[PDB]
Design a protein around this motif. Structure first.
Motif, short mmCIF file in Angstrom:
data_model
loop_
_atom_site.label_atom_id
_atom_site.label_comp_id
_atom_site.label_asym_id
_atom_site.label_seq_id
_atom_site.Cartn_x
_atom_site.Cartn_y
_atom_site.Cartn_z
N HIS A 162 -14.29 -7.41 -5.66
CA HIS A 162 -13.68 -6.17 -6.12
C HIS A 162 -13.31 -6.26 -7.59
O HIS A 162 -13.09 -7.34 -8.14
N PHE A 163 -13.29 -5.10 -8.23
CA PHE A 163 -12.92 -5.01 -9.63
C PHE A 163 -11.41 -5.05 -9.81
O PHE A 163 -10.65 -4.64 -8.93
N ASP A 164 -10.98 -5.56 -10.97
CA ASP A 164 -9.56 -5.61 -11.29
C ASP A 164 -9.00 -4.23 -11.57
O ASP A 164 -7.82 -3.97 -11.31
N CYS A 174 -9.72 -1.38 -10.14
CA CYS A 174 -9.43 -0.75 -8.85
C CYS A 174 -8.14 -1.25 -8.24
O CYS A 174 -7.56 -0.56 -7.40
N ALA A 175 -7.72 -2.46 -8.60
CA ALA A 175 -6.44 -2.97 -8.16
C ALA A 175 -5.30 -2.45 -9.03
O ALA A 175 -4.23 -2.11 -8.52
N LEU A 176 -5.52 -2.39 -10.35
CA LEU A 176 -4.44 -2.04 -11.26
C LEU A 176 -3.98 -0.60 -11.05
O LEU A 176 -2.80 -0.34 -10.78
N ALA A 205 -5.50 2.45 -8.63
CA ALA A 205 -6.51 2.82 -7.65
C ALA A 205 -6.68 4.33 -7.51
O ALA A 205 -7.43 4.78 -6.64
N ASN A 233 -9.04 -8.51 -17.93
CA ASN A 233 -9.56 -7.72 -16.81
C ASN A 233 -10.80 -6.94 -17.20
O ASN A 233 -11.64 -6.65 -16.33
N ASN A 252 -9.65 -10.06 -8.49
CA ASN A 252 -10.12 -9.50 -7.22
C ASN A 252 -11.53 -9.92 -6.84
O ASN A 252 -12.02 -9.51 -5.79
N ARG A 267 -12.73 -12.74 1.55
CA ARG A 267 -12.92 -11.30 1.39
C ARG A 267 -13.96 -10.79 2.38
O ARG A 267 -13.72 -9.81 3.10
N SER A 304 -7.11 -0.14 -2.04
CA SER A 304 -6.10 0.13 -3.06
C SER A 304 -5.02 -0.95 -3.13
O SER A 304 -5.00 -1.76 -4.07
N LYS A 353 -4.81 -7.52 -5.05
CA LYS A 353 -4.03 -6.61 -4.22
C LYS A 353 -4.39 -6.76 -2.75
O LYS A 353 -3.49 -6.82 -1.90
#
Ligand SMILES: *[C@@H]1O[C@H](CO[C@@H]2O[C@@H](C)[C@@H](O)[C@@H](O)[C@@H]2O)[C@@H](O[C@@H]2O[C@H](CO)[C@@H](O)[C@H](O)[C@H]2NC(C)=O)[C@H](O)[C@H]1NC(C)=O
Ligand SMILES: *[C@@H]1O[C@H](CO[C@@H]2O[C@@H](C)[C@@H](O)[C@@H](O)[C@@H]2O)[C@@H](O[C@@H]2O[C@H](CO)[C@@H](O)[C@H](O)[C@H]2NC(C)=O)[C@H](O)[C@H]1NC(C)=O
Ligand SMILES: *[C@@H]1O[C@H](CO[C@@H]2O[C@@H](C)[C@@H](O)[C@@H](O)[C@@H]2O)[C@@H](O[C@@H]2O[C@H](CO)[C@@H](O)[C@H](O)[C@H]2NC(C)=O)[C@H](O)[C@H]1NC(C)=O
Ligand SMILES: [Cl-]
Ligand SMILES: [Cl-]
Ligand SMILES: [Cl-]
Lengths: 240, 240, 240
Positions: free
Chosen positions: A113-115, A117-119, A121, A156, C97, C106, C134, C207
């Motif tokens: 997953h991308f960072d 999308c976490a920071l 969303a 990121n 992530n 994951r 998210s 996350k």
């Protein structure tokens, strides 16, 4: 148009997903050497080369490992052209949302997953395309959501950019990835975008694919893309 | 009821997920040959057969490869019965949402995507079950959303139908997949539905599973299912 | 603070993700034996031990298999310390992530699903974090949604609890998993929570990770955690 055989340089019109046949007839009957014999009768390759394509192993993962090993555009293109003539549905499957040639990159995109999308969303890419897999939207707000966030936190961008590359090489190993890496080393990221756009045009229905590609078009626009420097194995994937 | 031993034909009441034991006692102690010795003392198999089940390799992936190779219902059923008596929790795990016997199909369903979910993602299957993994809903609107779309574009029925099969064989290799393929070759798709319904009844809590199965029940109702023709390896999976 | 070398017992401050270096310098140049030579010059290990770390294979999956095999804290910690000194970005990647060290868990978390998320999917963990990925929310309602449901159906606590363990060992093989298992065998589940909390503090941005960890903190609070008994292979992972 383009003559991929006379070209001694890689051009974007000659990368694998753009040069594959659009569809096939009998895939079970053909082998690498038969389709190479056909390229020889076409006067595209020499009989020597056609008898030299045993260099691709019998298996498909091996053929791809060899193709990736090549240090010139002439050789890489020749092997890709034999390869995709034997597997003539290879990029045809990218017209759809499943397929054997897609297994590696879809797995990667749904797992790594991308960072960003976490920071935050909230952005439609993260909360709609990567999660919900819909991606029928043409409208992503990329700038409003992600611009200041990548501006502030550079590592990121580094992580999400390298992730985007890992995925791209899983989707399109060979010439397309080499073209992309090369435009990056030269500190001209946005010149890869043209290729990406042509790729989008070939697989209109692969919604996950289109979404991910639009995200990469975005990352390539950021100033931070022109400051990115490649790890040694990426540099190794390039040409002599 | 059904006598799976006297039957010389595959019947749906005799497919693997319906014939597995519901639960187990000590799995670590048993081997294929021990449980086959037990079927022999039961007068279900001969002592010859029981000494012939070394044909299953020591590993589980191998046992499954052998079971899939069988060209008759008698042999396939015998090997499945030994197999599932050694792995007695195999389909028990399908009562839940995780498990070793589920790894292949869940991975496939969350990675390979249907074309319909890309074309219009509003339908509750796509936007709720495949993405969000909830699937607690009993109500899907399949007809309102997908009927005209598959009607118009036949190659996306072809793709989504073959995808549904790839997944089904990852979930239930052996008799259940052979029964399904067979009803398809005969141009009677909907006669597989009965089996599917019985499968749903065994794993009420596996919500992803129930959703996917309801989708397949849907695809099998479409006229386009009776026009589908099987690729050569599917035909190979069938019986002599 | 903690002296992980003088300790003859595993303490939580000494588990792998807490003891890894925070970042690295040149990973390509180092090997297991070089970094072990460095621990020897530091007077942390003997020259004998440093010449004995060939016990880790050349590959990484093998090194991890050996580390997991160890039957004492002294040996497991020594091998982990050499290992993480060669792969110095190993737990650094958990700051983000994606990453190679994250691939196993994951994949597992997005494929193997919990029974609670199937039973009632309204709870923000299931419908927001596991699906939509998210997980930026700090607020989960765990109690309101899941308390009565696990109270009633004990086998779904059993399934979800063992699932949580399978995932934890995929994320943090070695000392951290051994510490967790051990607090469980002793019928003191909640004493693992302290470690989990320290883990959360190291990877604020991961996350998915934080969400899953908060869920495990939840499961460990349930009375049913103190009644859980370990399958034989879990008991084997422990110490002599
Ligand atoms: C969002 O960002 C893009 C590009 O990123 C910026 O580029 C630098 C100019 C600098 O401001 C960095 O910190 C940013 O990362 C913006 O689009 C570009 O703007 C420049 C300005 O000179 C222009 O020359 C380019 O052609 C633009 N397009 C590109 C690079 O593709 C954009 O305006 C920002 N804001 C919004 C709302 O999109
Ligand atoms: C949605 O489709 C199903 C079946 O698909 C149609 O079948 C053909 C009759 C033809 O119209 C194809 O283009 C479609 O793909 C409909 O249900 C079936 O209708 C037939 C009509 O004779 C009936 O005999 C069947 O028993 C029905 N059920 C089946 C095949 O399972 C359905 O009515 C369509 N509309 C809605 C709202 O569901
Ligand atoms: C939700 O559950 C937790 C703990 O689970 C309960 O623990 C037992 C007391 C019993 O009632 C089981 O059936 C439940 O599974 C509750 O928190 C604990 O309550 C005890 C009461 O003595 C207390 O001593 C603990 O310190 C509490 N915390 C723990 C164990 O971490 C909680 O109150 C329940 N309700 C809500 C709204 O959270
Ligand atoms: Cl290619
Ligand atoms: Cl089976
Ligand atoms: Cl470790």
């Amino acid at each position: 148009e383009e003559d991929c055989w006379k070209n001694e340089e890689l051009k974007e019109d000659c990368v694998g997903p753009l040069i594959a046949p659009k569809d096939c007839t009998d895939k079970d009957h053909k082998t690498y050497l038969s389709e190479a014999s056909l390229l020889a009768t076409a006067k595209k390759i020499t009989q020597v080369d056609a008898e030299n394509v045993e260099i691709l192993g019998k298996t498909m993962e091996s053929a791809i490992r060899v193709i990736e090993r090549q240090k010139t555009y002439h050789r890489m293109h020749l092997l890709e052209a034999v390869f995709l003539n034997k597997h003539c549905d290879y990029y045809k499957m990218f017209e759809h949302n499943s397929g054997y040639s897609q297994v590696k990159w879809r797995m990667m995109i749904k797992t790594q997953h991308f960072d960003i999308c976490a920071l935050q969303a909230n952005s439609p890419f993260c909360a709609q395309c990567i999660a919900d897999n819909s991606c029928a939207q043409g409208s992503w707000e990329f700038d409003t959501h992600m611009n200041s966030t990548y501006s502030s936190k550079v590592d990121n961008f580094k992580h999400d950019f390298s992730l985007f590359l890992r995925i791209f090489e899983a989707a399109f190993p060979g010439t397309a990835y080499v073209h992309l890496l090369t435009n990056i080393k030269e500190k001209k990221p946005y010149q890869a975008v043209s290729m990406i756009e042509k790729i989008k045009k070939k697989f209109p229905n692969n919604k996950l694919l289109i979404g991910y590609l639009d995200f990469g078009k975005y990352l390539l626009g950021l100033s931070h893309a022109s400051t990115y420097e490649l790890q040694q194995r990426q540099l190794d994937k390039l040409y002599q």
